[PDB]
Short mmCIF file of C-alpha atoms and ligand atoms in Angstrom, two decimals:
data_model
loop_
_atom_site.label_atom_id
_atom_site.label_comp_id
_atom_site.label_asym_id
_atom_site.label_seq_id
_atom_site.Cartn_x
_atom_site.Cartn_y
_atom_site.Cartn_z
CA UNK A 1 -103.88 107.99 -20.13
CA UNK A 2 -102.24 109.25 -23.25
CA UNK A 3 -99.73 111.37 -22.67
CA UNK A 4 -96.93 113.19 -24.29
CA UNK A 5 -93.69 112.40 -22.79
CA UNK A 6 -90.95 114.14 -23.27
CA UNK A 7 -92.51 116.67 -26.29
CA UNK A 8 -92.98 113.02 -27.71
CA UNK A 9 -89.28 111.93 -27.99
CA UNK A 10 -90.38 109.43 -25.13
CA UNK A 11 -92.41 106.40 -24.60
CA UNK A 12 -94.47 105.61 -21.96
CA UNK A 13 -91.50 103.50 -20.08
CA UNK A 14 -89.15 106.90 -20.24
CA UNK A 15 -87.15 105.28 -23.41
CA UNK A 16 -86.57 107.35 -26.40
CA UNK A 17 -88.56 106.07 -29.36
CA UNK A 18 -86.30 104.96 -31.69
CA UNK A 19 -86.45 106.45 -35.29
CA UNK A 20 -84.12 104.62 -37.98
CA UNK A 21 -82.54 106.87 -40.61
CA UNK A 22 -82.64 109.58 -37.91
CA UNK A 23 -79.67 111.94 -37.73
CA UNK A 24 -78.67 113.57 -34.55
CA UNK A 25 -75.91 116.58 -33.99
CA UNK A 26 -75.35 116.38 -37.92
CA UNK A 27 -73.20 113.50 -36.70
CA UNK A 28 -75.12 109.93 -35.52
CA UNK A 29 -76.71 108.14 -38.01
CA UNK A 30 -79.11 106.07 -36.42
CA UNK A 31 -79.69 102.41 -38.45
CA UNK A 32 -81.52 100.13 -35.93
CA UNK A 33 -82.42 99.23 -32.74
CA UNK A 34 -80.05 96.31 -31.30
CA UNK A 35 -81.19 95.84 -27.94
CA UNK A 36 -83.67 96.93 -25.04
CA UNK A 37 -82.86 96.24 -21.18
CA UNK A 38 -83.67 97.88 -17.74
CA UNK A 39 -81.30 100.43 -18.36
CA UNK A 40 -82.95 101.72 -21.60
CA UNK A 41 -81.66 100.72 -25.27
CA UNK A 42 -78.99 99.90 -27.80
CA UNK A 43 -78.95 101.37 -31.08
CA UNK A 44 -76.53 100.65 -33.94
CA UNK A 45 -75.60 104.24 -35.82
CA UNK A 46 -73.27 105.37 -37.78
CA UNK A 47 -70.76 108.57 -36.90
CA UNK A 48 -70.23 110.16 -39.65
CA UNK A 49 -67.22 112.16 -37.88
CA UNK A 50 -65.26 109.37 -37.02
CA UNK A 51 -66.50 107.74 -40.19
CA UNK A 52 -67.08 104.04 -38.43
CA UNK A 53 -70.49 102.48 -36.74
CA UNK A 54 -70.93 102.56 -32.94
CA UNK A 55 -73.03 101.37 -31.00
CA UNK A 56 -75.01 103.98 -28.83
CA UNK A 57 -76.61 103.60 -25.52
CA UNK A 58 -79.90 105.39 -24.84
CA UNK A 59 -80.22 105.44 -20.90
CA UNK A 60 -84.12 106.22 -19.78
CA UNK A 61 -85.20 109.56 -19.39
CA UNK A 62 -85.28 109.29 -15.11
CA UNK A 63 -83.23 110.51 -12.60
CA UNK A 64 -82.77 106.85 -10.76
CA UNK A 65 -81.64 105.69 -14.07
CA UNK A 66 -79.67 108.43 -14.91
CA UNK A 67 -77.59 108.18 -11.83
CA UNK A 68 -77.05 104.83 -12.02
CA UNK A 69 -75.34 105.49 -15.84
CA UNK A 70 -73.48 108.09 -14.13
CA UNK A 71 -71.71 105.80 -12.79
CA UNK A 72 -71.07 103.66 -14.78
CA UNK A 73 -69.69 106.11 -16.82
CA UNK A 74 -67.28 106.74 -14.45
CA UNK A 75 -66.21 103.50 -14.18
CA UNK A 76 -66.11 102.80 -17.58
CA UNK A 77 -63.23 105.89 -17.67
CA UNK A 78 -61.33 104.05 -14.92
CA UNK A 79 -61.05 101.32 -16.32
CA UNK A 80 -60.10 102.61 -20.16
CA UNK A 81 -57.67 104.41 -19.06
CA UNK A 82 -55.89 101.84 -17.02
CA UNK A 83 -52.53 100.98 -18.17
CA UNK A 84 -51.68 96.86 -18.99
CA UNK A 85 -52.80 95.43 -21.75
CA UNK A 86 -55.50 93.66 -20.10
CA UNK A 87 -57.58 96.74 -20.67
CA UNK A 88 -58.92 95.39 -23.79
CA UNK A 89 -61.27 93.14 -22.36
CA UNK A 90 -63.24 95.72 -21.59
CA UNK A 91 -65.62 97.50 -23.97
CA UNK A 92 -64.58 100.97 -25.24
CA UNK A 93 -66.51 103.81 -24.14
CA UNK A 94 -65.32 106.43 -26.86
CA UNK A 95 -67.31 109.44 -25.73
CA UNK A 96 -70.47 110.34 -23.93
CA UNK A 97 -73.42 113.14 -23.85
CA UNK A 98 -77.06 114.21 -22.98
CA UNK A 99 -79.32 114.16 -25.59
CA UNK A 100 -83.20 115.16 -25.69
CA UNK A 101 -82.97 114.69 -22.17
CA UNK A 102 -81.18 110.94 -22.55
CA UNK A 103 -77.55 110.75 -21.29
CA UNK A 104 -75.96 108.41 -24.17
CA UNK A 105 -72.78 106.49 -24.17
CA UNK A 106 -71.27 105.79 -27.49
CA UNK A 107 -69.37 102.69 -27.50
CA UNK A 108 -67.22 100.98 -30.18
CA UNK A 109 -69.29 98.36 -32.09
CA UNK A 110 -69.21 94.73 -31.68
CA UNK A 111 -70.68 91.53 -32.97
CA UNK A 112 -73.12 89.11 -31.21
CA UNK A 113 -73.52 88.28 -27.36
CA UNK A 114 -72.87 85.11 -26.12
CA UNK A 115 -76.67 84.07 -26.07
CA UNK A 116 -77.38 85.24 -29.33
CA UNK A 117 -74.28 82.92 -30.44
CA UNK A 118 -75.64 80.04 -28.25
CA UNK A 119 -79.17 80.77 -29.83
CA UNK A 120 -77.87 80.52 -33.57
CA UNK A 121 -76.28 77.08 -32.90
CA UNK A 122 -79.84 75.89 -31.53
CA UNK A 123 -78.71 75.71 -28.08
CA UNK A 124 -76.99 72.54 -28.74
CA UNK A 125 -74.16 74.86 -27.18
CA UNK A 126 -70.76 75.89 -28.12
CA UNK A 127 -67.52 73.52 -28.70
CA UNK A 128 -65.14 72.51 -25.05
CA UNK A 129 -62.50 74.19 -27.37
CA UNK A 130 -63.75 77.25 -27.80
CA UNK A 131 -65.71 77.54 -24.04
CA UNK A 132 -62.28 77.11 -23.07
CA UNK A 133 -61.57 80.03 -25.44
CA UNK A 134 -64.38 82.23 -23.79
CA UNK A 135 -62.84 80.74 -20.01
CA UNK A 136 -59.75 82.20 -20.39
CA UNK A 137 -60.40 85.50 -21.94
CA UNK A 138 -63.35 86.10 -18.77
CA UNK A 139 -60.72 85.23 -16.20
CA UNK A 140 -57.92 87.53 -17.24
CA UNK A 141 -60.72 90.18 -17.17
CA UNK A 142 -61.49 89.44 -13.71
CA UNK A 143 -57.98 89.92 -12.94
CA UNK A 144 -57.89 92.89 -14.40
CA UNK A 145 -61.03 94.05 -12.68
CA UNK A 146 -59.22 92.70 -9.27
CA UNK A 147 -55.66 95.19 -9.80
CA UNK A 148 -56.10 96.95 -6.35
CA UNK A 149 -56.88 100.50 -8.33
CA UNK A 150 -60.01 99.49 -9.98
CA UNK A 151 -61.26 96.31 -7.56
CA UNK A 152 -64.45 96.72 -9.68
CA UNK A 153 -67.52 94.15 -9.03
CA UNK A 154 -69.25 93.92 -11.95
CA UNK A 155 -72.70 92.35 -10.50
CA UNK A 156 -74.58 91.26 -13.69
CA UNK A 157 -72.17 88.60 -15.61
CA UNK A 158 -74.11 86.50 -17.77
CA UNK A 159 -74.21 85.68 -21.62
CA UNK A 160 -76.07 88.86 -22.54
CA UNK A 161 -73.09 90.90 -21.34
CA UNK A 162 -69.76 88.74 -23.06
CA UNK A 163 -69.98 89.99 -26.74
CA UNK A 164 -67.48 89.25 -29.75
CA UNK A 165 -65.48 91.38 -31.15
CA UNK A 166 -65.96 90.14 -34.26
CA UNK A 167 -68.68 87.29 -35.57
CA UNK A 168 -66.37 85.09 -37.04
CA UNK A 169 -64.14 84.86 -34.33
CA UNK A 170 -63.29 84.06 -30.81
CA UNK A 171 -62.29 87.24 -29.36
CA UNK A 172 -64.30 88.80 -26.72
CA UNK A 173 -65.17 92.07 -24.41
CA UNK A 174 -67.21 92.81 -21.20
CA UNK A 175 -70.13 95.05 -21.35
CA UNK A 176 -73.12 96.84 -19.19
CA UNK A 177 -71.14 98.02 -15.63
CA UNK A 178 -74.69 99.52 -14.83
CA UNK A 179 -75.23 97.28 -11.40
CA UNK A 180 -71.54 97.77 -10.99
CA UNK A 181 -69.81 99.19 -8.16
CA UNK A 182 -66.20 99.21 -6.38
CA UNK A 183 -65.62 96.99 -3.40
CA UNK A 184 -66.86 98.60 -0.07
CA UNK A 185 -68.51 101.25 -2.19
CA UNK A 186 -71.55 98.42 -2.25
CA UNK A 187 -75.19 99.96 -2.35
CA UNK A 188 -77.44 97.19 -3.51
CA UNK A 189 -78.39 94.07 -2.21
CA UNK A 190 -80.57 92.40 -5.07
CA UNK A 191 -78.36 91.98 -7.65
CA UNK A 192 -77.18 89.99 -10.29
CA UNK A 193 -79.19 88.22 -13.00
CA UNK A 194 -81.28 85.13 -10.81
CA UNK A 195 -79.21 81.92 -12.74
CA UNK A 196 -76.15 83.57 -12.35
CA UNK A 197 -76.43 84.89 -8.49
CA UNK A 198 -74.36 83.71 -6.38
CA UNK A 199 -75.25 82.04 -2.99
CA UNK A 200 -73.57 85.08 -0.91
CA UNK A 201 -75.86 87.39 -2.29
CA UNK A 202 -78.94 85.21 -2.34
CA UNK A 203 -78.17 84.11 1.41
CA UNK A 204 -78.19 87.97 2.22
CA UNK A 205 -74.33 87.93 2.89
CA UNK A 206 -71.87 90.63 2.11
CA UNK A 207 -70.09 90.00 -0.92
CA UNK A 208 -67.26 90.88 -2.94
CA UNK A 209 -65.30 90.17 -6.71
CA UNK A 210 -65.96 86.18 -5.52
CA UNK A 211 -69.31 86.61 -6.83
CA UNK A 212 -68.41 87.35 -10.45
CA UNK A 213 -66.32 84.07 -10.39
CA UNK A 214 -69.53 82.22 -9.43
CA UNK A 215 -71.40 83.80 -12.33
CA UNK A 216 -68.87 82.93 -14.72
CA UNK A 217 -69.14 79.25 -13.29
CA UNK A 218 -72.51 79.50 -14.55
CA UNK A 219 -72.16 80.97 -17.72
CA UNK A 220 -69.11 78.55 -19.10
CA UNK A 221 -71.25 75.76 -17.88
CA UNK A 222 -74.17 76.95 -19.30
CA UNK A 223 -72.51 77.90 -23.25
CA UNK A 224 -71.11 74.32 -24.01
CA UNK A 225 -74.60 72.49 -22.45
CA UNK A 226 -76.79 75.05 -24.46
CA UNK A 227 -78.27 75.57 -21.67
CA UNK A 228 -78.52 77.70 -18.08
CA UNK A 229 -77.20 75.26 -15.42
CA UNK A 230 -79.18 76.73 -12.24
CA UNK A 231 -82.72 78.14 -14.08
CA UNK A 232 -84.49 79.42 -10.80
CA UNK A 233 -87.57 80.82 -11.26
CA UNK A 234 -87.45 82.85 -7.75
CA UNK A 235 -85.09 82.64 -4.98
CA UNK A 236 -86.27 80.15 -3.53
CA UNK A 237 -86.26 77.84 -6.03
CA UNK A 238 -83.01 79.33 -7.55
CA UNK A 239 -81.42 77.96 -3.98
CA UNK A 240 -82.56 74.63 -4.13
CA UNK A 241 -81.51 73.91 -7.93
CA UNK A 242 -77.73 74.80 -6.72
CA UNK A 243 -78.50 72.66 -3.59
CA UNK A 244 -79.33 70.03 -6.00
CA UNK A 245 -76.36 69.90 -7.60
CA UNK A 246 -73.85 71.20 -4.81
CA UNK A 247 -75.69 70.18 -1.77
CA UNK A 248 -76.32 71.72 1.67
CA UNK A 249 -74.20 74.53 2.24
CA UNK A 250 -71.91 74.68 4.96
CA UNK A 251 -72.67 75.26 8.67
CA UNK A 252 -69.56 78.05 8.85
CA UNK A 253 -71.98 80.10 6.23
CA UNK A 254 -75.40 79.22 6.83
CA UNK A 255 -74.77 80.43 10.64
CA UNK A 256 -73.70 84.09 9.23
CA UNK A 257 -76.50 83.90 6.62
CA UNK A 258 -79.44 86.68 7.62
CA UNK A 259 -81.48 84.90 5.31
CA UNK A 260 -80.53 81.27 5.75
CA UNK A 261 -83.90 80.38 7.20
CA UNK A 262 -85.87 81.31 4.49
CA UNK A 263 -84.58 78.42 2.52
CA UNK A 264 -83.00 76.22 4.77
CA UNK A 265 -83.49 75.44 8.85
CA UNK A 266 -81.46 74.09 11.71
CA UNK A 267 -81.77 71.37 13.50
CA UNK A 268 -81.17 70.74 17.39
CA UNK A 269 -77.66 69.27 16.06
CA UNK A 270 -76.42 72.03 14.12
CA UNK A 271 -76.59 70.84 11.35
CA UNK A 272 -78.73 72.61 8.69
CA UNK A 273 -81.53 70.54 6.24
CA UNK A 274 -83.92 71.98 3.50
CA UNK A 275 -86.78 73.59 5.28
CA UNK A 276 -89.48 71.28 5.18
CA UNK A 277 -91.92 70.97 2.52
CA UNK A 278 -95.81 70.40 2.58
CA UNK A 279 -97.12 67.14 2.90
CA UNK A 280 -96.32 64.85 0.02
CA UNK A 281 -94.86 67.31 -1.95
CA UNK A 282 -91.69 66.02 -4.31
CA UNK A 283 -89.88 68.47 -6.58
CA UNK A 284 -85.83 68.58 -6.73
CA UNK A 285 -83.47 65.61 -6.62
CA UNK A 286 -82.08 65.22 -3.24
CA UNK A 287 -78.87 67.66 -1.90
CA UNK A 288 -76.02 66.54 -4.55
CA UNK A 289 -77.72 64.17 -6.53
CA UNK A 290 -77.24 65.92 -9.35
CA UNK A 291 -73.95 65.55 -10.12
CA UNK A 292 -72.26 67.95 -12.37
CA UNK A 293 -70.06 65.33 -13.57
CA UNK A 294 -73.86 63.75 -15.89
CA UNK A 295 -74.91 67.13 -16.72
CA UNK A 296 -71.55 67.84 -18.57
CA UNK A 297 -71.75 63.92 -19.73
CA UNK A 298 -67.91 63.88 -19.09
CA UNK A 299 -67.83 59.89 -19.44
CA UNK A 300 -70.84 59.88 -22.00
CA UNK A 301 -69.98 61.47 -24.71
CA UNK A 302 -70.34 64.87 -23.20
CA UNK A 303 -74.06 67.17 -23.08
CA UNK A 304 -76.82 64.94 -23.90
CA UNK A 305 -74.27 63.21 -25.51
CA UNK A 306 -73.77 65.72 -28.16
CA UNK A 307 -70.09 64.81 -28.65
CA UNK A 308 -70.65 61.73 -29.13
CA UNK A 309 -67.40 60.53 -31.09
CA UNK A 310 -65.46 64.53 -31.99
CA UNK A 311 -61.94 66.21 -31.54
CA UNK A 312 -61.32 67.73 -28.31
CA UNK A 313 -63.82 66.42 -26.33
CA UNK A 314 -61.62 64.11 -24.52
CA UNK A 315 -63.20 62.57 -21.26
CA UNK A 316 -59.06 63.63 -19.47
CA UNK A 317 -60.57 66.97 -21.15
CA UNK A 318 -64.11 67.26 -19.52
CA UNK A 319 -62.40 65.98 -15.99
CA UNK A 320 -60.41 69.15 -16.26
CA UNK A 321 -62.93 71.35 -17.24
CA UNK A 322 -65.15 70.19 -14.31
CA UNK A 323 -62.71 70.83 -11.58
CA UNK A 324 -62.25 74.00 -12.89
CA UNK A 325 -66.04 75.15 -12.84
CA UNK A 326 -66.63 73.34 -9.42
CA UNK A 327 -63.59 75.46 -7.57
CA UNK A 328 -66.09 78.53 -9.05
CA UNK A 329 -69.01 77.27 -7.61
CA UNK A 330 -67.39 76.97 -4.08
CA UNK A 331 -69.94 77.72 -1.79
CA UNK A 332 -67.06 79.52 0.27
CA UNK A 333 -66.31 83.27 -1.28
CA UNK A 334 -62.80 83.17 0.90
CA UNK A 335 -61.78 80.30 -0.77
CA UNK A 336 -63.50 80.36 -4.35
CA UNK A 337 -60.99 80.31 -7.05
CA UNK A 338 -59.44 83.55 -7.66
CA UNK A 339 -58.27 85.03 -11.35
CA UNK A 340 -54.70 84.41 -10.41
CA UNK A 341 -54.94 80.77 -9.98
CA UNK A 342 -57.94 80.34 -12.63
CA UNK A 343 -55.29 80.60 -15.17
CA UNK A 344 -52.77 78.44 -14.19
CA UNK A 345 -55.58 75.44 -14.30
CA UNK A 346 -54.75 72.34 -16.00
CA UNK A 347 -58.17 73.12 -18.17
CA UNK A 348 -55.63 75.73 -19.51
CA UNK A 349 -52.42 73.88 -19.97
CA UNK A 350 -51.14 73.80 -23.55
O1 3RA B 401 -73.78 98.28 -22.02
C1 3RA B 401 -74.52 97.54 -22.67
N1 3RA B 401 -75.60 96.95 -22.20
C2 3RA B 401 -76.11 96.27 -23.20
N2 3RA B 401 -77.21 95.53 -23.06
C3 3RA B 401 -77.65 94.72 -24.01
C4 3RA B 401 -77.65 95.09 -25.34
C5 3RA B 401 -78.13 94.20 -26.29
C6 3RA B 401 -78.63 92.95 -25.95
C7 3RA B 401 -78.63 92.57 -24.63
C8 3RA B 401 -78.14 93.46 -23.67
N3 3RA B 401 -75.37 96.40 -24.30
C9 3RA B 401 -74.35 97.19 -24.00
C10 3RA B 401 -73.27 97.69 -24.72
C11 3RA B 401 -72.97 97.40 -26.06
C12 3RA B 401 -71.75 97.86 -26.56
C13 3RA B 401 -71.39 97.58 -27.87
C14 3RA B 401 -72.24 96.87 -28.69
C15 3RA B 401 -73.46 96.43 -28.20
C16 3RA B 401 -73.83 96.69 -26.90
O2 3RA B 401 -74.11 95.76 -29.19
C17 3RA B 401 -73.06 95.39 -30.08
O3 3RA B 401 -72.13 96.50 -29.98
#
């Protein structure tokens, strides 16, 4: 098998094969690739029409794909054109088009993702101060994502989709709405990126704009520790690494769950345990004994102690930070901690 795809503007996975200095509609510039991902690619190119770089998003040459970036794109134009200024913590789609049989959304440009800046400080992770930063710019997104007109789930929150603005500062947008989707408008049940699912969706539960809260629990945790906090390989094991540090959950959920027994079981009582495990076989700490409180090091000097002895990184500091993150990862979606509260945390309080 060597086929042409495409009159050989394709690849073999139904991505355009990216050619640097090539110019397209007398107008793109193409300089580099910048990223790959299920959807298709990222490629940094300059318009010489607008005279500034964007960043241009090559969506797979296949229906399913194409579809699915359909949209997106529509949701991307919902939420642009919504009115408060909370609009601009989400990316910019300037203008969109088929090309060679790719539909491509041109986006402003930004600077690195949140793992690439977590990478480049050797994953010794980012300062309290500035996760804080991060923390507060996320949750006035998800409020703006909650106004009743959008109520836009964005399914895939996770380091690879927070970017800066700019690489020298703070300042931050949302990106990649491809799993997206508007609440009751829900078509997919496997979703979100494994360490940042949530337990509704890995239970088999319906879910809602709780689950992006959980995900951002996840990521916060995971950008000052350097770090991912629950690293499942599989769903199965994903479960029992939050059980480890959260416990069983509770009865009131695991009795809705469809899938509750493929992790968990319940006993004559009621009351729901692990599922048992072969003979002999040890591998997570038991239910909770994993306390979040030693993975942050709150009283010891913070992750791995790390902190050891610096500004901000007050142990008063860490105690508030932890609350906040734990009233994210509340096992309950009805009573997870909602944008509108999020913000008026004492991890906040100036
Ligand atoms: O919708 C997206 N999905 C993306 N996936 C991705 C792209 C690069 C690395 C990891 C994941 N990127 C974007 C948008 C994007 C928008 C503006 C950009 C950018 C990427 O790179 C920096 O400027």
């Amino acid at each position: 098998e060597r086929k042409v795809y495409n009159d050989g503007y394709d690849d073999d996975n139904y991505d355009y094969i990216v050619k640097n200095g090539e110019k397209w509609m007398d107008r793109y510039e193409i300089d580099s690739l910048i990223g790959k991902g299920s959807f298709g690619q990222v490629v940094k190119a300059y318009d010489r029409v607008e005279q500034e770089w964007v960043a241009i998003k090559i969506i797979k040459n296949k229906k399913a794909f194409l579809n699915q970036a359909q949209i997106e794109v529509r949701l991307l134009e919902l939420m642009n054109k919504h009115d408060t200024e909370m609009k601009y913590y989400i990316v910019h789609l300037k203008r969109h088009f088929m090309f060679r049989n790719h539909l491509c959304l041109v986006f402003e440009m930004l600077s690195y993702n949140l793992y690439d800046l977590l990478r480049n400080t050797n994953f010794r992770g980012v300062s309290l101060n500035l996760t804080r930063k991060f923390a507060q710019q996320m949750c006035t997104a998800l409020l703006f994502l909650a106004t009743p007109e959008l109520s836009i789930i964005h399914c895939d929150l996770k380091p690879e989709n927070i970017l800066l603005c700019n690489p020298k500062r703070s300042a931050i947008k949302i990106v990649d709405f491809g799993s997206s989707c508007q609440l009751g408008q829900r078509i997919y049940q496997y979703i979100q990126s494994r360490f940042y699912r949530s337990p509704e969706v890995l239970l088999g539960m319906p879910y809602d704009l709780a689950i992006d809260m959980w995900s951002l629990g996840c990521i916060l945790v995971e950008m000052h520790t350097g770090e991912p906090l629950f690293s499942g390989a599989n769903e199965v094991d994903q479960m029992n690494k939050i059980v480890e540090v959260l416990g069983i959950p509770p009865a009131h959920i695991l009795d809705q769950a469809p899938k509750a027994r493929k992790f968990f079981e319940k006993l004559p009582d009621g009351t729901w345990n692990l599922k048992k495990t072969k003979d002999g076989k040890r591998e997570y700490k038991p239910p909770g004994t994993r306390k979040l409180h030693n993975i942050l090091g709150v009283e010891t000097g913070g992750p791995g102690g790390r902190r050891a002895g610096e500004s901000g990184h007050t142990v008063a500091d860490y105690l508030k930070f932890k609350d906040l993150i734990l009233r994210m990862l509340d096992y309950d979606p009805k009573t997870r901690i909602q944008p509108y509260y999020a913000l008026q945390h004492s991890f906040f309080k100036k």
